Every structure is written in structure tokens, then in C-alpha cells.
Amino acid sequence: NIIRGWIFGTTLDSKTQSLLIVNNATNVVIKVCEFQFCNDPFLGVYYH
Amino acid sequence: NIDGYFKIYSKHTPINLVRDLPQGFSALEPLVDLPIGINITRFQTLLA
Amino acid sequence: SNNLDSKVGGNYNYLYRLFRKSNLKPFERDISTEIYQAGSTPCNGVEGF
Ligand SMILES: *[C@@H]1O[C@H](CO)[C@@H](O[C@@H]2O[C@H](CO)[C@@H](O)[C@H](O)[C@H]2NC(C)=O)[C@H](O)[C@H]1NC(C)=O
Ligand SMILES: *[C@@H]1O[C@H](CO)[C@@H](O[C@@H]2O[C@H](CO)[C@@H](O)[C@H](O)[C@H]2NC(C)=O)[C@H](O)[C@H]1NC(C)=O
Incomplete structure (x- = not known):
């Protein structure tokens, strides 16, 4: 379960709206906001 | 993403492939239609 | 909606x-x-000709 979602949008940097679809461990979240995305986005896991 | 109606179709197939997109045929069933109303020209996946 | 959306000094909350x-x-x-331009010049910051 390594791929978990997507960012969609014309400008992912709060100049415009964008769509987040992200399947986290507990419950998938879908959101449409003027998101200010990170230059290198990911989700992290403690292993063992 | 048509007229803001961001439409998702999907399928899940059990495989045993090692290093390629599995050769074969399957049709995706529509699951949900989001009324998002935004400009989607770009996208980026989220990984763990 | 003149009973709901009009104010005696002007209801200037309704943008287009x-x-x-x-x-x-x-x-x-x-x-x-973002600031629009009506001329062939580029325009930057908050305002311009
Ligand atoms: C969605 O976003 C893209 C990217 O910003 C828009 O593409 C722009 O189109 C205008 C049209 O006048 C051009 O002046 C810009 O230079 C374009 N930007 C880029 C980076 O290519 C696109 O028009 C938007 N689509 C809608 C329907 O709003
Ligand atoms: C995945 O994201 C969702 C949405 O942010 C998280 O749901 C939150 O869970 C906490 C703890 O139960 C609640 O207090 C919040 O109200 C929830 N937020 C929403 C908007 O539902 C969820 O916890 C996240 N899962 C993981 C594994 O972090």
C-alpha cells in the first residue's frame, strides 16, 4: 500500500483551488481547497 | 474532470506480476462523481 | 431580493x-x-496603468 492518493489542480500553491484525494491509514479524505502544497509531498511510516 | 464533475472509475485485480503492467483485459466500474467545479490541468501522486 | 440584498448606502458585499x-x-x-491587464504591457504587484 505505497501509492495512496493524488493532488489535482492548475496551480498547486493557493493562487487557485486544488483537489486532494488521499487514502490515509484510518479513513480516506477528499478535499477541494486553495491548498498551499509542498514542493516534495509524501506520507511517512515508522517501520517495526 | 467534466464540467467540475470529477468522475472516478476503478477496478482491483489480484496479480502476481514482478516488473510490468499486466497484459490482459478488464473494464472499470464507475464508483463516485465529485461535484468539485475546479480547473484540473495538472496532477501529482502521493507515496508512502 | 430588494428587501434582502439592498442597503440605503449601497450593499457593496455582492461582487462579480x-x-x-x-x-x-x-x-x-x-x-x-490576480491583477488583470487591459494593455500590451505586463503588470505586476497590486496596481498599474
Ligand atoms: C487552467 O489553468 C491553466 C494553467 O494556469 C490555464 O492556462 C492558461 O491559459 C491562459 C489563457 O489566456 C494563458 O494566458 C496562460 O498563459 C495559461 N497558463 C499556463 C501556465 O499555461 C488554463 O486557461 C486554465 N483553464 C481554465 C478553463 O480556467
Ligand atoms: C486521516 O485523516 C482524517 C481526516 O483528517 C483523520 O480524521 C480525524 O480523526 C481525528 C481523530 O479521531 C478526529 O478528531 C478528527 O475530527 C478527524 N478529522 C476529520 C476531518 O474527520 C484521521 O485521523 C487520519 N488518519 C490517520 C491514520 O492519521
């Missing part, structure tokens, strides 16, 4: 888009607040 580079698509929503 006055400029855009081209027409938008059916059921699309333009919310962009």
Missing part, C-alpha cells in the same frame, strides 16, 4: 467578475484575485 482573459467553461467557478 469584471475582467477575465477568456470565457470560462460550463459550471466552472473563477475565484482568482
Whole structure:
């Protein structure tokens, strides 16, 4: 379960709206906001 | 993403492939239609 | 809605888009607040000719 979602949008940097679809461990979240995305986005896991 | 109606179709197939997109045929069933109303020209996946 | 949306000094809370580079698509929503240009010059910051 390594791929978990997507960012969609014309400008992912709060100049415009964008769509987040992200399947986290507990419950998938879908959101449409003027998101200010990170230059290198990911989700992290403690292993063992 | 048509007229803001961001439409998702999907399928899940059990495989045993090692290093390629599995050769074969399957049709995706529509699951949900989001009324998002935004400009989607770009996208980026989220990984763990 | 003149009983709901009009004020004796002017209800200036109701905005509309006055400029855009081209027409938008059916059921699309333009919310962009970037400065538009009516001339061949580029324009930057908050205001200009
Ligand atoms: C969605 O976003 C893209 C990217 O910003 C828009 O492409 C722009 O189109 C205008 C049209 O006048 C050009 O002036 C810009 O230079 C374009 N930008 C880029 C980076 O290519 C596109 O028009 C938007 N679509 C809608 C329907 O709003
Ligand atoms: C995945 O994201 C969702 C949405 O942010 C998280 O749901 C939150 O869970 C906490 C703890 O139960 C609640 O207090 C919040 O109200 C929830 N937020 C929403 C908007 O539902 C969820 O916890 C996240 N899962 C993981 C594994 O972090």
C-alpha cells in the first residue's frame, strides 16, 4: 500500500483551488481547497 | 474532470506480476462523481 | 431580493467578475484575485496603468 492518493489542480500553491484525494491509514479524505502544497509531498511510516 | 464533475472509475485485480503492467483485459466500474467545479490541468501522486 | 440584498448606502458585499482573459467553461467557478491587464504591457504587484 505505497501509492495512496493524488493532488489535482492548475496551480498547486493557493493562487487557485486544488483537489486532494488521499487514502490515509484510518479513513480516506477528499478535499477541494486553495491548498498551499509542498514542493516534495509524501506520507511517512515508522517501520517495526 | 467534466464540467467540475470529477468522475472516478476503478477496478482491483489480484496479480502476481514482478516488473510490468499486466497484459490482459478488464473494464472499470464507475464508483463516485465529485461535484468539485475546479480547473484540473495538472496532477501529482502521493507515496508512502 | 430588494428587501434582502439592498442597503440605503449601497450593499457593496455582492461582487462579480469584471475582467477575465477568456470565457470560462460550463459550471466552472473563477475565484482568482490576480491583477488583470487591459494593455500590451505586463503588470505586476497590486496596481498599474
Ligand atoms: C487552467 O489553468 C491553466 C494553467 O494556469 C490555464 O492556462 C492558461 O491559459 C491562459 C489563457 O489566456 C494563458 O494566458 C496562460 O498563459 C495559461 N497558463 C499556463 C501556465 O499555461 C488554463 O486557461 C486554465 N483553464 C481554465 C478553463 O480556467
Ligand atoms: C486521516 O485523516 C482524517 C481526516 O483528517 C483523520 O480524521 C480525524 O480523526 C481525528 C481523530 O479521531 C478526529 O478528531 C478528527 O475530527 C478527524 N478529522 C476529520 C476531518 O474527520 C484521521 O485521523 C487520519 N488518519 C490517520 C491514520 O492519521
